[PDB]
Design an enzyme around this catalytic site. Structure first.
Site, PDB file in Angstrom:
ATOM      1  N   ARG B 117      89.717 -40.722  79.795  1.00 60.97           N
ATOM      2  CA  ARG B 117      88.760 -41.978  79.121  1.00 60.97           C
ATOM      3  C   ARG B 117      89.799 -42.495  78.694  1.00 60.97           C
ATOM      4  NH1 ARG B 117      89.228 -38.476  73.377  1.00 60.97           N
ATOM      5  NH2 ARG B 117      91.277 -37.870  73.260  1.00 60.97           N
ATOM      6  N   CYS B 121      88.636 -51.542  83.488  1.00 52.77           N
ATOM      7  CA  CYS B 121      89.707 -52.362  83.335  1.00 52.77           C
ATOM      8  C   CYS B 121      89.141 -53.473  83.054  1.00 52.77           C
ATOM      9  CB  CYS B 121      89.302 -53.152  85.075  1.00 52.77           C
ATOM     10  SG  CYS B 121      90.093 -54.394  85.206  1.00 52.77           S
ATOM     11  N   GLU B 156      89.686 -44.976  69.957  1.00 55.48           N
ATOM     12  CA  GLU B 156      90.458 -45.274  70.501  1.00 55.48           C
ATOM     13  C   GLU B 156      91.612 -46.599  71.859  1.00 55.48           C
ATOM     14  OE1 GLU B 156      92.593 -41.476  70.560  1.00 55.48           O
ATOM     15  OE2 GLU B 156      92.538 -41.257  68.803  1.00 55.48           O
ATOM     16  N   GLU B 313      89.198 -39.804  62.067  1.00 63.78           N
ATOM     17  CA  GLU B 313      89.759 -38.708  62.844  1.00 63.78           C
ATOM     18  C   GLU B 313      90.998 -38.131  62.223  1.00 63.78           C
ATOM     19  OE1 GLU B 313      89.737 -39.172  67.132  1.00 63.78           O
ATOM     20  OE2 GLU B 313      88.589 -40.443  66.733  1.00 63.78           O
ATOM     21  N   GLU B 361      89.377 -30.270  74.993  1.00 63.44           N
ATOM     22  CA  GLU B 361      89.198 -29.919  73.173  1.00 63.44           C
ATOM     23  C   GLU B 361      88.572 -28.937  73.185  1.00 63.44           C
ATOM     24  OE1 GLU B 361      88.173 -34.306  72.398  1.00 63.44           O
ATOM     25  OE2 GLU B 361      90.467 -34.212  72.497  1.00 63.44           O
ATOM     26  N   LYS B 362      88.603 -28.028  73.661  1.00 62.81           N
ATOM     27  CA  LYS B 362      87.415 -26.760  72.935  1.00 62.81           C
ATOM     28  C   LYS B 362      88.269 -25.729  72.151  1.00 62.81           C
ATOM     29  CE  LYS B 362      88.245 -23.029  76.923  1.00 62.81           C
ATOM     30  NZ  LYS B 362      90.205 -23.669  77.602  1.00 62.81           N
ATOM     31  N   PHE B 363      90.345 -26.087  72.162  1.00 58.83           N
ATOM     32  CA  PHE B 363      90.761 -25.118  71.178  1.00 58.83           C
ATOM     33  C   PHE B 363      91.321 -26.752  70.357  1.00 58.83           C
ATOM     34  CE2 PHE B 363      91.487 -22.366  74.749  1.00 58.83           C
ATOM     35  CZ  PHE B 363      90.572 -21.326  74.103  1.00 58.83           C
ATOM     36  N   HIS B 364      90.547 -27.328  70.429  1.00 53.74           N
ATOM     37  CA  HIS B 364      90.796 -28.393  69.235  1.00 53.74           C
ATOM     38  C   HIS B 364      90.199 -27.957  67.818  1.00 53.74           C
ATOM     39  CE1 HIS B 364      91.084 -31.922  66.363  1.00 53.74           C
ATOM     40  NE2 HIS B 364      92.394 -32.112  67.411  1.00 53.74           N
TER      41      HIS B 364
END
Ligand SMILES: [Zn+2]
Lengths: 679, 684, 684
Positions: B117, B121, B156, B313, B361-364
């Site tokens: 991500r 360019c 970001e 965030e 990010e499943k364990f975020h």
């Protein structure tokens, strides 16, 4: 009653080495001496041909087998059996130059140049065809040579290829497994970060400059590689079997090897073999290291349900590739070799009979040093082990009767280590599993090291440290096993995801939540400087007391039927359940919510063994660092008493064993004594 | 008297999350439950569409907006606003496949493959045009949807590209900046190692296998990237403004982010928003981390002169990507959120409302765990926080009145870090600035965090730790500020180079030499095992005593009108001046010649604050690890008392204050719990 | 009786710097001030033209020599000589652009872009031709300029190229050396892992994605790079000589440099020069570092059998590229410079006369700071060293008379460091050799640092730490040397392999087994946590006692004529011989079976010195950290007393000496300050 020996021709334990006489054809005096010394040392097996491709086919399509005819005839004349190897471990330079597709492309997409070993592309039709041709020659020439007792397929299969052919193959594999892109995208949750695959040609192997954050992908890549090598290995085997279906085939496995699921690869072999190079004498003591080794031996035996395995490689002294090249101290070579035998080895073999004179493994240990003879400390201990082994013929084929099973599961491991969190600084799976094993091994209780697909019915006790992935059937089998009277033990970070690394939505321990009778709400992660403690509840059924140190991972749990055996002593979750037991059918399921110290595992499992009346190798207390292993032919039992401490250790015998050993036995430092008895 | 709220539709603080329903369209039950729990948690905002491109345009040219129509309607029916995002944070796989030019080329010249991500360019005409189309679709369909309160531009922004097209842009950029190769060669001192550029086509971005020792090049490459992204962001905003000029636009910033000069990128945005994931509870204590986070909060506010910002965030619990995934201890989520508010946030938002089921990010952390409800410990504390934030409606739009400014300058930092010397083992710029900040923050004294280009004239105190680069005007403004009665503090390794990293020849502190009244002859560099000490001279104006420890860097200075406040205890420069003050006009300029301990900073800045009579949030002594922040609407003040300690902390109130949250007057003796926060309100 | 000076023009020691006026042509006042300050610091030499390629040829074929004509004229008018450099250390940007073949291809096969330095392909016909033209220009223009006293060939040759031209060159090198593939395959034992080469085109330089486990190939790759650079440097020298055969040529060598065998490269030079940047004041003390530096000085002198060398580069203060940029403490600059002179330097020169304003070396030390003058602590100490050096004119050309030789062999090191085992964690070859050296240096006993090809006859005592490789002739020479009454000392891991890293088969230590009278059966490898002990046998000839501490490596040996001087105190080989001596002809050969601590070396070497009656610089006990070095012109002796302690140290003179620098006679009791040096002279 007893397993068949590796060959109908042999009648005891084998003792041997990788042999590379092709490096020495300019000195026939060395080849004659090699054999005299083999017999002096009581070696009766060698592995031949492993890195011999260029010595067998120096030019494309032109073969030179004469030296090998000679080598095989000489070993046979002198009563030495051979594991004949297929040379696919290292292609010649001409083959690299003419057919560059046999070389690998790296994960970083860097194309390899010629060199090294074990680094072939596994898709390459050229290489697979040259292997067929070569193996066909070896088989038609040698599959009825009376020396030959088995096939050593390649050497130490390992690594992965990302070339375009392998990408095509991988795409096809995915398309067979999930039938639509729909299935795939769902299984991988690929809508996250807009990773939705809308065409099959978009799928690609992981890479650092591309995609390495899609867990499903990384996991299936490992499964795919496993299938690649398993198919590669099958294909190697078939022309051999075509000429003589009676010769068994193996390939030599590595220490806790991560690249391939050995459970899958094992289904193509007739018997298991591996290569063990523990770093003896490099730590405070060798006790931990010994238990870690011993657990992997058990795994190797478990891969074919108790069938004995071959220790295909080990060093008689030191290796060349570790941070240090420590000498095994006097006695330790016997001890380490006999430890293999103790856990199911029917052969003790080494890397190198004779040290190479040049190149990267010229300072790897061997039976025959550069000095040209075996009147050296190393040589003498090898010969002495030869004697010991020839005196242990009755142990050949004997069984290990384990009523304890510990789960070590490659797929769970892969998905757990790839995941981001809950402790990216380190989970230490191997080590954690082994920490459980150690408390049993310290008691001389036998363990099988299964994966989560194995049938649990023969066991009394099944232990699953960090069974992160619980595939379909697994929770049901476990639940049925407990219900039927079994006892189950699981830890923190079990029952989290499924086959494709999707989290369960019913609360964690997932499919294991009903049997364990607890809900794990969250897991805390600890730095290396931080700790908590676990203390037993007065009157608890295992007599746990402590307190014991808890480090790295501590889960916060809730009772849902289970009773608390111990609680945390510190942090915001102080006073909360830390260790629990749940009644389920006629069995009990234990849950350990934190990673605990060695004393905890010792208390926990010695109590649990006493309560369950689990059989021990000997019924006597064993001092710390002393262990015991048992094999049996149904008529006698053979007890391997082992002392991994660096000083003398004294044991009291509860009965009489064989002449007849005293009632009270001092094992020297790194000592081993084998006690026998009728049942 | 009081800043405008983010929208005419809102009346208080916002509370919400990044929301990714497009991952859950196969379970409509979940989407319904989502909204129910959102209201039960008091969440009144969600960011939507951030990574939705393949959910909006699964094939080239063909759009699928129905699901988003539904989400936005549902959130609006339920009294929940939306920051609608442009999805340029992650392109679809078909786009990478068809137009590889959208992928970057790395600094090591390795071309990227599809995946990850934030890695597009920024030159690519195809990507810029594809973004224009998508953003035009989004605007034309939703710019007047009553849910939408603002634009979340990309996600970001970060990283760099070295493909031939970007090299081309970089050459043009350089040529527009310096007009001739003459000016460029002199600016960069390129005769050194025979690196003279004799043609514009010889210019190349830095690489490990090519050139990376030409400092001027490295610096301008960073400047160039900054302008690339600022242009990229403008072009993204415009078709949205075209459909509705009243909707504000932001892009979410990162913790002390190094790649881009945020002072330039902020000039294209209406409001500032950022993403904060401090590693709570991983160190000895959380005090230094707390101040470090606070300082960045102050920077985010300062970027638009006091205008409140959005905390776009944060995690309600843990992250997935640090060495540890420590749980926030009971109360800490409340405290870290309210900290953001205390220092100017008008919104508290979380990364993820619902945990992803799979992928990286499943364990975020999130509001809604895999367990599918918010009757969890994390859930209950989020909901409680939601109650407190609705009770704090009057704080929204309030201002932070700071009379102290600290300089944190991206260009100075870039050139200073890129230099070879004077301590390659580490300069720790962010850490050094924050060490200064902490002695003020511990007293409850407000600070703006400006760069060297800001106007100094509203401040009583300006502090410039390691202002390595002093650009044209800065020295002059600084001097003027002091002459007019201002007070100035600079440390070792300030006033060393100009806009292109050429060293000054007039003796160091360069342009600041006159005002400081000292000459810095040379800088000594110390290993991690080596230390010196600094001791007060008897009768010194600041009452400095010690000895204080000095580490890492020690400057040898000569008085040129300044007086010595303290001297060195040790080494061959023992007895020499280590801390100085200089009278200049009506003001005083201080210089600290060595990197000193937390105790030094505390004595220095408490003394200086007493003497200068700087305003505090509360006029009572604050125990160590307790801090106080003040906001005001011009009528009331809101004091945020914060205990970052892991135990109870009891403070006395020197006035009477009301409990804005729970009602009534707070008592005079006030015990803050471990990781506690209490909000005092009072009329001025 | 005394070596010739570097030129007929000079009469004493040179003092000077690398000088890059071409960076400063826009400020003629600078260039004037330069020269004024050069004389004020007593600097009589400068190296000019090193990175001047783009200042000499800013477009292809088109030259600009006028600034250099100026510079050389002005230095000459002011009594300053010049080492004129060839500028091949940095190509211009246009040359890289137009001829990409001048760039290198890395070991990893990644092709370099333009930038950096010292990174030219050495097979490149275009670059060698351009170097021919450029050098031919410089020579025809300047070979008879009165300022010029020598040639500075390139700058710090280093690195390697793996481009297809260099691969071809390498295949032709191997074929010319092995003749057939048969011989090659045998030498490298390539039947191992089926690596049998069946065609010369199959051969390839090592790589990480290819082959880097064939030792024969790794070792020969380094010999080939040595021959490549040796040829390249010859080719640079020949046009210069063609215009003036009287002008000597050097190239500047680096600290224990690993890429090239300097014994080969030196054969092509008239005199030796090198570049020293010790990290002074970064450890517990500077004694070990000082002995380590001294050893290399001695090596540099030994390369031309006692012929004085040039310290081409060093810093007057700090560097820019080390973890710390520590200041040399007061006195240390003098001491570190005089150390070079004490071990055979006839010139002391610094990198940079004036600090560059702009690129990566702008914070590297120089005589002239950015402040623009030399009334600075650094300048003043430089000036004071200038005085001292001029006062030491008689030392110029004086000899060092060493009856001890230590073997430092590049090929042995290469093969040993590439081997897998017996300790991959680290063998620390340089450090181990220097550990031996220090025990002699501590006594003020002179040492030549030879390789294994040098003639041993002139020495009484030859020491071979880890002489892993014993090539043809070496064992016979050593044995002859001992037999004739010589004394030899060897260690563990000596006599293991031959020229192509094939193990010996008779038993270790191979060709030295007769002379040493022991068999080394096996070597044990110790972690950094582990040790053993060595304790002297009662009545042993060396009066060894202990126990001493043994680390890392311990061999198990068997006596075959030799007697044990000590035994091990631990592990399974406790009580076994650890140290041995053997009578062989009229000599004695010692073997040390384990790596032992400082105290062992001290006891061993002080006893062995007293017994052999080796000559000391001074016949007095030296305190710890105090050393003494002796030069002689055949008439007088110059003794350099050196204190590397950070406090005062007192020494008793056993005779009377004049102070050659400050005048008159010295007393018999003498106290040296911290980092102090005193030079004592006297007639023989
Ligand atoms: Zn492949």
């Amino acid at each position: 009653t007893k397993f068949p020996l590796l060959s109908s021709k042999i009648s005891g334990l084998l003792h041997g080495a990788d042999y590379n006489p092709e490096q020495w054809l300019d000195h026939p005096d060395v080849l004659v001496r090699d054999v005299e010394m083999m017999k002096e040392a009581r070696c009766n097996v060698m592995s031949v041909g492993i890195f011999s491709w260029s010595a067998l086919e120096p030019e494309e399509g032109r073969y030179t087998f004469d030296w090998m005819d000679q080598v095989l005839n000489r070993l046979h004349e002198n009563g030495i059996s051979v594991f004949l190897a297929t040379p696919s471990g290292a292609r010649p330079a001409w083959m690299s130059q003419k057919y560059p597709q046999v070389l690998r492309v790296g994960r970083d997409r860097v194309p390899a140049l010629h060199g090294g070993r074990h680094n072939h592309c596994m898709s390459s039709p050229v290489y697979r065809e040259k292997v067929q041709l070569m193996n066909g020659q070896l088989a038609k020439r040698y599959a009825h040579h009376p020396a030959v007792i088995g096939w050593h397929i390649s050497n130490e299969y390992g690594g992965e290829c990302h070339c375009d052919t392998c990408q095509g193959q991988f795409r096809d594999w995915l398309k067979a497994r999930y039938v639509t892109l729909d299935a795939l995208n769902k299984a991988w949750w690929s809508t996250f970060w807009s990773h939705t695959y809308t065409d099959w040609s978009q799928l690609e192997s992981p890479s650092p400059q591309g995609e390495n954050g899609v867990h499903g992908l990384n996991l299936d890549w490992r499964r795919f590689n496993t299938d690649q090598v398993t198919r590669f290995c099958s294909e190697e085997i078939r022309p051999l079997k075509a000429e003589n279906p009676a010769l068994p085939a193996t390939t030599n496995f590595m220490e806790y090897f991560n690249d391939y699921d050995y459970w899958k690869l094992a289904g193509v072999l007739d018997f298991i073999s591996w290569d063990s190079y523990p770093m003896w004498h490099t730590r405070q003591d060798d006790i931990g290291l010994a238990a870690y080794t011993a657990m992997y031996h058990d795994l190797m035996r478990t891969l074919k349900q108790g069938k004995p395995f071959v220790l295909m490689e080990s060093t008689p002294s030191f290796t060349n590739w570790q941070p240090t090249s420590k000498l095994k101290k006097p006695g330790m070579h016997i001890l380490s070799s006999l430890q293999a035998v103790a856990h199911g080895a029917d052969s003790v073999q080494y890397f190198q009979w004779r040290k190479s004179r040049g190149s990267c493994e010229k300072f790897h240990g061997a039976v025959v040093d550069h000095v040209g003879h075996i009147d050296t400390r190393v040589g003498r201990e090898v010969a002495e082990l030869g004697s010991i082994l020839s005196a242990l013929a009755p142990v050949a084929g004997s069984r290990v009767e384990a009523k304890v099973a510990i789960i070590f599961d490659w797929e769970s491991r892969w998905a757990m280590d790839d995941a981001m969190g809950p402790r990216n600084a380190g989970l230490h799976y191997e080590n954690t599993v082994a920490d459980h094993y150690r408390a049993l091994w310290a008691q001389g209780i036998a363990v099988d090291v299964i994966n989560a697909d194995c049938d649990l019915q023969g066991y009394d006790l099944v232990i699953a440290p960090m069974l992160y992935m619980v595939r379909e059937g697994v929770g049901e089998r476990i639940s049925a096993f407990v219900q039927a009277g079994g006892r189950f033990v699981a830890t923190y970070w079990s029952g989290i995801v499924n086959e494709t690394d999707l989290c369960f939505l019913n609360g964690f321990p997932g499919p294991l939540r009903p049997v364990l009778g607890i809900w794990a709400e969250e897991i805390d992660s600890l730095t290396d400087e931080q700790h908590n403690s676990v203390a037993g509840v007065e009157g608890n059924a295992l007599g746990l007391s402590g307190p014991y140190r808890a480090s790295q991972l501590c889960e916060v749990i809730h009772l849902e039927g289970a009773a608390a055996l111990a609680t945390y002593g510190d942090d915001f979750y102080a006073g909360n359940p830390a260790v629990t037991v749940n009644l389920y059918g006629k069995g009990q399921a234990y849950y350990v919510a934190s990673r605990n110290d060695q004393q905890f595992h010792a208390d926990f499992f010695t109590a649990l063994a006493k309560e369950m009346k689990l059989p021990r190798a000997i019924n006597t207390p064993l001092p710390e660092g002393v262990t015991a292993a048992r094999r049996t032919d149904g008529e006698s039992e053979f007890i391997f008493l082992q002392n991994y401490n660096a000083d003398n250790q004294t044991v009291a015998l509860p009965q009489d064993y064989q002449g007849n050993l005293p009632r009270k036995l001092t094992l020297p430092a790194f000592g081993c004594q084998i006690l026998t008895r009728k049942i």
